Design a binder for these strands. Structure first.
Lengths: 90, 55, 95, 78, 48, 76
DNA sequence: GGATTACACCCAAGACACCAGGCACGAGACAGAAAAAAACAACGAAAACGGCCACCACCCAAACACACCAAACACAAGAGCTAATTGAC
DNA sequence: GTCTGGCCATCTTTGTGTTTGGTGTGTTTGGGTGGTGGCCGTTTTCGTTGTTTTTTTCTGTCTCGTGCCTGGTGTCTTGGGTGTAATCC
């Protein structure tokens, strides 16, 4: 019931669901493996966060579709792998 | 036109990205046209699957 | 200073032409400018590819019309072609 | 820094995606998928930046890198 | 002995934790809930 | 080697083409390319359908697996 | 003497989702004799595709001109993040 | 008490507009060729016909697999219960 309350609450809002500093630290950690002393405009991080969340939400929608297809409420890693294989990503 | 309709539907007199997203994803032809684009602060359409609804 | 161009005033004029008592946020005006640029780029790339297929040095209204037909869905393409033909004939009839 | 994507954040993303129940390995799976996505996108962006002979990653590089993948984004100057 | 171990296939429909014991010619799994749910495996019969 | 018969496929293609412009001519290589693309597409679709059917712990492919595959692919 | 009484807090239970085994009825694979038409080859006719030569309107290019488009930031104010709850049920 | 709404007491910087002014589009005329048009060629696409035989098909039969129903687990939360606890006649 709280699950459905949260679903209704989060399909209504548009605010970013990841904290900004962790995502910035992750981005800098990843970027540091290609070239040291790189700088990022704040808008670049914002765009990356928007794209990453949109991607993850679409992936979770496909995963939910797969899980319902198998007749399960619970999404599982095999559902994710199947969705990514059918998309053509893995 | 569709975004203004969507913004009036929410009783707002100014168009925000949410209304653009609703207008795009709610129109079949536009949603087919803009099928790969993501809108920042657009959100998602409210959609709850039939089998997840309570009993 | 940096005098960079956009479509904001034209989008605003169109909005007031369709919806008089409705405004638009700046972020949505940015999104609409990006949308216009995207659609322009798609149409121009299709027109270029068509011209190069047909061995022509010129992008005319025939290329634009057929690129519109290729890109947009049925009713949308039909209405857009209607609008474009109307505007072209009205511009050509006068001078 | 990959631990910064906490379990509640993945839960929130799944709830906005309409997911009602979540396994326990979904979090690690999602972290791996996100890492792959971000790796590809940041690699393309850094390629654009190096070509432009810059040391700062702009929003234009990210937008062109997403256009390269097919993930066109509106509202960042495109 | 190794404590708090599950066995597959389960000798009973109920999943129960057991203790695994090393003996002279094999291993014994023994459930704490029922003495009758013992699983004996000889070393001579293990292939891998 | 192609699995759909060539002349029935030609007739199908002509029948479908009869809506967009009356009395069209076709190159033979055009029909050959169409058949190759169609069979490749269908084989990929049957691959995805088989994946879904196996996911459902089955071995028989059913129309809902096709529908799920076309939904995930982004097909309308 | 001994009973009526005050008080934390534990155990039974309900509602939610799942892995595994079992049972059954049907729908699908396999085989066989039959009807079907794809395919192979041949020849005929001709719509239309590829090429060529001419001729002109169309678009690129200068040069000078003025009005529509840009940012600054003045001036006016959208309606979020906050907390309670009109209105049917 | 559930749920979507129409609004609030306070935050934040946005959103529509006037303004200065300059540059970028608009008018004018000149040139050169790209692109239409016409006329001719000849390949190639449609069209049909006969004969062969592989493929499709209709059908039957049996079994294996799909789908429904069950026990038992873990898990969050609501509820009835009781013993600890104790003071008054």
């Amino acid at each position: 019931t709280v699950a459905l309350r949260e679903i209704r609450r989060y399909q209504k809002s548009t605010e970013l669901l990841i904290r900004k500093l962790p995502f910035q630290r992750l981005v800098r950690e990843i970027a540091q493996d290609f070239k040291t002393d790189l700088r990022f405009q704040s808008a670049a991080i914002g765009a990356l966060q928007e794209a990453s969340e949109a991607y993850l939400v679409g992936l979770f929608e496909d995963t939910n579709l797969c899980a319902i297809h198998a007749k399960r409420v619970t999404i599982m890693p095999k559902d994710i792998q199947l969705a990514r294989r059918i998309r053509g990503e893995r | 036109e569709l975004a203004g309709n969507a913004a009036r539907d929410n009783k707002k007199t100014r168009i925000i990205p949410r209304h653009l997203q609703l207008a795009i994803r709610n129109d079949e032809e536009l949603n087919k046209l803009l099928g790969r684009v993501t809108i920042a602060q657009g959100g998602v359409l409210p959609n709850i699957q039939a089998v997840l609804l309570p009993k | 200073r940096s005098r960079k161009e956009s479509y904001s005033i034209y989008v605003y004029k169109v909005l007031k032409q369709v919806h008089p008592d409705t405004g638009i946020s700046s972020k949505a005006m940015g999104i609409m400018n990006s949308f216009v640029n995207d659609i322009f780029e798609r149409i121009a790339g299709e027109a270029s590819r068509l011209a190069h297929y047909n061995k022509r040095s010129t992008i005319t209204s025939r290329e634009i019309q057929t690129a519109v037909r290729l890109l947009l869905p049925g009713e949308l393409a039909k209405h857009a072609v209607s609008e474009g033909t109307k505007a072209v004939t009205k511009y050509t009839s006068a001078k | 820094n990959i631990q910064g994507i906490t379990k509640p954040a993945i839960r929130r993303l799944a709830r906005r995606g309409g997911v009602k129940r979540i396994s326990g390995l979904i979090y690690e799976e999602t972290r791996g998928v996100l890492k792959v996505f971000l790796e590809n996108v940041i690699r393309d962006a850094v390629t654009y930046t190096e070509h432009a002979k810059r040391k700062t990653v702009t929003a234009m590089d990210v937008v062109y890198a997403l256009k390269r993948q097919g993930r066109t984004l509106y509202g960042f100057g495109g | 002995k190794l404590e708090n171990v599950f066995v597959r296939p389960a000798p009973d429909s109920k999943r129960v934790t057991g203790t695994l014991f090393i003996h002279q010619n094999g291993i014994r799994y023994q459930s704490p809930v029922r003495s009758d749910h013992r699983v004996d495996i000889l070393f001579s019969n293990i292939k891998h």
